[PDB]
Amino acid sequence: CPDPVYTCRPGQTCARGLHGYGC
Known about the structure:
Layout: no helix or strand
């Protein structure tokens, strides 16, 4: 994702701060 947070797949959504887990 464009956001500064962890980048997630294109098809899948990207979330920020998830139980200390990234994409």
